[PDB]
Amino acid sequence: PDTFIDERTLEVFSRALNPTNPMELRNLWLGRVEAELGDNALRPEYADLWRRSRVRRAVSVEEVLRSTATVGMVKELFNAFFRDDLYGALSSKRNIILSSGAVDEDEYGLPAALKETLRFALARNFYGYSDSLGRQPAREAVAAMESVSMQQGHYEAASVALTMGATHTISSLADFIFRDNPYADAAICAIPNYPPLVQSIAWRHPVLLVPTPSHGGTTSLQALSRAVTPNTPMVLLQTGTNPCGSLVDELELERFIQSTSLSTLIILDECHEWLGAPRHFSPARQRANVIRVSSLSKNWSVPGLKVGWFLADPALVSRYYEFASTSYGGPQSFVYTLVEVLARFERWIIEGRTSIDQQQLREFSASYGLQLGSLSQTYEHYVAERRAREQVLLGLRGEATSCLRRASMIVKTPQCSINVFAQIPGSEDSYLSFRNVLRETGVSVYPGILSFYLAGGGFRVTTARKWGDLHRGLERLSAG
């Protein structure tokens, strides 16, 4: 099963001087961790802080899950992990990094066609000022690509907003939504989730954290449906779950969406719905209160470009125009061509097109100066590259799961994306497990506490790495 909160979590919240202080909670958590790192403590000050601590109150599960200090403390542990733990004090060139959560952009980066579009946009000086929601051809191509994948329904360009990645998108959406919001109930965040998104939402409104447990690669929205209220302002839900790799059922997602008031906005984070996820979307996903957020960071492995978009009702997009104008003045024009060339290409794959004729060449404007033969060859090569990347990534994920299971670890079977959730038997602290594994074998893993798994000792392993790095890391991990 999945463990989300127990008494071991309540201990830290009951021993703190002021529970509403995220930094004190982070210090107590790290102090406990370094207390069971007796001899190998990286900082004995925090261990001493934990030793002097005393229980002074009674804390319940509901209080922890309804507290903004929980989100703050997880965000502080997230910050420490990257700042002064793995790339700080314990930084090394022999450490094998299996905790990024990102595809290795050297082995599997942007395909040649999209790189060529970026080069072309650079040569054409396509970096002038752009509209707050993006240029029209890119939005039209994105609308067609999103429409081709639905069971029923259709998207127009008026329902597409181009943004600078998912983190910025949910941050901007939370800020834009919570200006004039009559509803006073807490925004609901389904856990496990990404700490930056939950923190950006909790910046604006109180947050209720609702576990969304997984069983056999299927994500259960049973408790989430009960949690949602007719006065809920918004609900952030991840369709492809991180870190375990479980996937929501389309019928269950449809029923949950239909069981919600039109006053409750639903943000569907779909950044992990690839590499095995079936993409036949119910029409309920096109409802008037549903916002579908996607980015290019994972599926195309370009986090540094910061390109994404969201789909919503046309009125909401028209209102978001002004917010985007005031906040950042629109997205990068320099990537528009890429987006367009991506979307049409993607559509011609879903449409089952092996080849391209003159009809698909009129999709693009004549200013680009495209020829039929060059475009056809480019599309063939792009299809081949995407297929090869998908096959290799699936093979790597399967091999990593098999090796972790053979090394006597409790491993959840991933249904999507590139991450595998594993646990060493008998382990009760995920961050302690990170410290122990890093010191013992020199391999960095991603503790589950940073995915809002407040209980248990499981960690996340990223399998979309170079074969050499993954093989050496798995050998060291199984040896220990």
Add this chain to the structure above:
Amino acid sequence: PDTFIDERTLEVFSRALNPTNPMELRNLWLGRVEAELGDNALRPEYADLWRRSRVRRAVSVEEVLRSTATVGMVKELFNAFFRDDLYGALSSKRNIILSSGAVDEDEYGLPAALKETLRFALARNFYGYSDSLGRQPAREAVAAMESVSMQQGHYEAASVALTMGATHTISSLADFIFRDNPYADAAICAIPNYPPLVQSIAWRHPVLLVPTPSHGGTTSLQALSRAVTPNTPMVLLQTGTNPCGSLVDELELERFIQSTSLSTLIILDECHEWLGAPRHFSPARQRANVIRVSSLSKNWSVPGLKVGWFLADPALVSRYYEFASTSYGGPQSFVYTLVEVLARFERWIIEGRTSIDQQQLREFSASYGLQLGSLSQTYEHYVAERRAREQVLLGLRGEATSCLRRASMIVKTPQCSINVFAQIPGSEDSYLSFRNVLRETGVSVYPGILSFYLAGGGFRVTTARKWGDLHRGLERLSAG
């Protein structure tokens, strides 16, 4: 002189049903404008709305300048101008656009060296995840480049934060500053200013608008100093003024900065301090409460790349790390190389270096694989290109000013940047002047109301265009 507010402005605020409604104020403003467009009214509905309007209250100058509805109304007029006025109903392919405020990226775009760095970063897959404040070499180069231009003092890489442009930077700073802010007085915005920045600040805190009048190309901070209070949270001030092109005096800016409490943050918007601006900065500009914001949008003509940075106290930057992590997860890594290659190059120009030896080649890392001869030739060509661009732009600005004066217009002499503020004699409404000029001569100009000049009929002319476009526009403008 400069006119900022008169009775003609108070009329609209006194005839509105609810003064706190920005949309009603925009409708009344447009209705008046289309009322003096008797036969040529683009929308008679707004004219009818204005005709039925009646005075129902007394409005003062202080009420208008202290109201958030003024900022909202100017933002709405700004939105209308681009959405349903110039690129909407009145869109045409014969209109000559002289109102963008941006350098023509076709004739005067990014230099070849920076394009080559972008191409190299693309070839190296330099689009992985990056730190919230940027990568270290880029920050170090930016710190050195900023330090070389000060009379006294020095900047370290810890005082540099890389961001995605000035609009996003001031929006993020306004959000980040006004979370835990004990001071309840209004944030002070110096006008003329950019409506998106003022609106992003007014999103978070009440705003007081303070005129900063110009006389002979010199911007006067006389009333701004009186306006500032020891409990002022922040002050947004533009060192190179838009649209007139006036420049603050370094001694006056130093005195104003020194006359401020350390509790008052000062955001210096320096995006227009080029093309004639002397860049010998006083040490007061390096104070602990001064934030210096800059972008590449104007000086290098790349608004679509969205690259910028700000300089602040190291503690403030260290605090901004977490905000950047939560909001957007850091800037684009894909541009880091460019920034670095820019900064060092810029420094070698300020240092008066004609040539480059092996000592400057160790500035960059050996991973880039740089050779001495290629780097030397590239630097020579970059210096030549920057010099030529500056000379051409200065010539164009001077010619535009001379032509506008010869066509019997009251024209302020620009001391910096690329814009010229002109006024047709006898004109009392800037947006009416925009409509009249666009209909009569087919040339679009930028009304001064969109620069927070609530009175007068002056408009802004952008002279950093192709010579053909500027020549034809000036001919049509002088003919009429």
